[PDB]
Amino acid sequence: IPMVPAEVGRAVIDPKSYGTWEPLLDRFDALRAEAPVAKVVAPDDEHEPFWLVSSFDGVMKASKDNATFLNNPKSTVFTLRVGEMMAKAITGGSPHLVESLVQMDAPKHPKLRRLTQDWFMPKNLARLDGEIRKIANEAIDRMLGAGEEGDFMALVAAPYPLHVVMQILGVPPEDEPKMLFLTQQMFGGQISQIVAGAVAEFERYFAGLAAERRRNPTDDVATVIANAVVDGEPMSDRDTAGYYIITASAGHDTTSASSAGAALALARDPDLFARVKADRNLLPGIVEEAIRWTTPVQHFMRTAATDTELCGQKIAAGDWLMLNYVAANHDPAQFPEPRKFDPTRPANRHLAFGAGSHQCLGLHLARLEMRVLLDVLLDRVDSLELAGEPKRVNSTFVGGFKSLPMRWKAA
Ligand code: HEM
């Protein structure tokens, strides 16, 4: 049993390691080369032990072997023992606050996933070009309305993807502060009874939204969810609400982070800014690299179903494991100069969307949201730059930017 070095075991679980970023990257360089599958054990037992998987190859094999590496038995995100208890008191014994797609395994998982799979294809999403473009123009309206200076997060990256996800879920605009509470507080990085209450309110709320989409079906994803048939029957209100909830929470901060990372890289490299300004076909490479370079979803966990080996390391039945995508996406085995923001890297070769049977349902939509936003930005600004220091959020699960002060000149 290889052990992670003590300092690294402390760092990998610390939200501030992700805000800081660089030192953690260095610790992954040293760890991944010596022991890409290594045990993290807390000296005073504040969390259950887990295997840190730190190489691209480890995360890739772990991700693809969904029969061996399960999402349901244990919390799907790293948590300290206290958070796990809190979750179980809130739900009456499950570690999953809400139990949605990402927390399920076969046979239930693929049945529910398959429901929206067609809707999430590029083909179908291309029908939302206009609706997204309208929300991007609204985002850039706010940017330019602020003057020649302001916080890119507050103005553009934070609200925009949430507006897009409200639009595809049929959430009315006046319910925006409820959705933000949902993605910023309920999820995001006797209080048990208020969270239990709030969960139940969201479920009742989404059950009603789904009722309306059964009466008045539309082209959006809420309609697909609401009208689903599983095993000859409709989905329960719990599952139906679970589907709305995951779409919104998987869809928001993640796309905020990569949108932000893309604007950051454009702001810091004005020669690249000018080239994509003149040739928008450069945009897909930039989008893809912003997702890799930011790695908005920083880890997911798994539980081993059975005794197995990963990278020749023995893993015992019921072992908890962290698939660390930050570590995976900065592996020099796959990425030359892993640190550099490089838009010339090829598509569909990073692990920011994971791989295997849970691979991100929304990855085409995410990419599309970013491409559209950036196209709009590029038409409407002649010049962009940083006006202060970019700050990362301190969180272990979904990361991103707290603050992104910039300065620009309106085209
Ligand atoms: C840059 C933006 C995004 C990133 C980095 C990202 C990342 C991920 C990752 C790593 C997973 C788990 C994959 C695995 O376990 O192998 C996932 C799952 C998922 N994502 Fe995305 N995501 C993003 C955007 C979105 C968007 C915009 C939506 C929809 C609006 C979405 C919907 C989902 C859903 C429903 C799942 C669960 C899939 C399943 O369990 O089968 N995601 N995402």
XYZ file of C-alpha atoms and ligand atoms in Angstrom, residues 63 71 101-102 109 113 120 165 168 246-247 250-251 254-255 258 291 296-297 300 302 325 351-355 357-363 365-366 369, ligand 1:
80
model
C -13.568 6.026 -15.372
C -20.969 5.844 -7.903
C -28.117 10.434 -12.375
C -24.558 10.977 -11.151
C -28.378 4.621 -14.265
C -29.381 8.637 -18.666
C -27.995 16.476 -25.569
C -29.909 26.351 -17.898
C -33.733 24.849 -21.179
C -28.726 17.764 -11.548
C -29.204 19.555 -14.863
C -24.137 20.201 -13.141
C -24.780 22.975 -15.719
C -18.930 24.320 -14.205
C -19.699 26.340 -17.362
C -14.543 27.413 -18.100
C -12.183 23.476 -20.233
C -14.045 23.051 -13.510
C -14.961 19.665 -11.980
C -15.262 12.646 -8.504
C -15.910 5.965 -6.772
C -9.254 15.405 -12.843
C -10.627 14.211 -18.851
C -12.525 17.352 -17.692
C -15.764 15.692 -18.826
C -14.669 12.280 -17.447
C -15.122 9.157 -19.562
C -20.783 5.574 -18.699
C -21.240 8.794 -16.621
C -19.268 10.941 -19.123
C -20.764 14.461 -18.960
C -24.219 14.517 -20.540
C -23.954 18.256 -21.192
C -20.494 18.479 -22.706
C -24.037 22.170 -24.560
C -21.194 23.470 -22.346
C -22.510 27.928 -24.503
C -17.346 22.870 -18.564
C -18.561 22.480 -18.170
C -18.775 21.059 -17.559
C -17.893 20.196 -17.038
C -16.382 20.336 -16.857
C -18.607 19.001 -16.618
C -18.057 17.885 -16.015
C -18.715 16.712 -15.719
C -18.122 15.480 -15.182
C -16.606 15.288 -14.861
C -19.112 14.584 -15.054
C -18.995 13.126 -14.521
C -18.374 12.266 -15.620
C -17.903 10.922 -15.098
O -18.205 10.566 -13.922
O -17.182 10.203 -15.842
C -20.355 15.245 -15.471
C -21.611 14.684 -15.473
C -22.805 15.271 -15.815
N -23.009 16.495 -16.397
Fe -21.396 17.762 -16.931
N -19.946 19.194 -16.886
C -20.080 20.430 -17.471
C -21.253 20.972 -17.944
C -22.497 20.411 -17.947
C -23.713 21.028 -18.466
C -23.797 22.441 -19.134
C -24.710 20.152 -18.237
C -26.214 20.260 -18.557
C -26.856 21.430 -18.540
C -24.153 18.994 -17.577
C -24.875 17.880 -17.193
C -24.353 16.749 -16.609
C -25.115 15.646 -16.162
C -26.639 15.455 -16.165
C -24.101 14.667 -15.632
C -24.407 13.294 -15.030
C -24.110 12.278 -16.146
C -24.279 10.862 -15.639
O -24.175 10.629 -14.400
O -24.543 9.969 -16.479
N -22.797 19.177 -17.431
N -20.071 16.533 -15.872
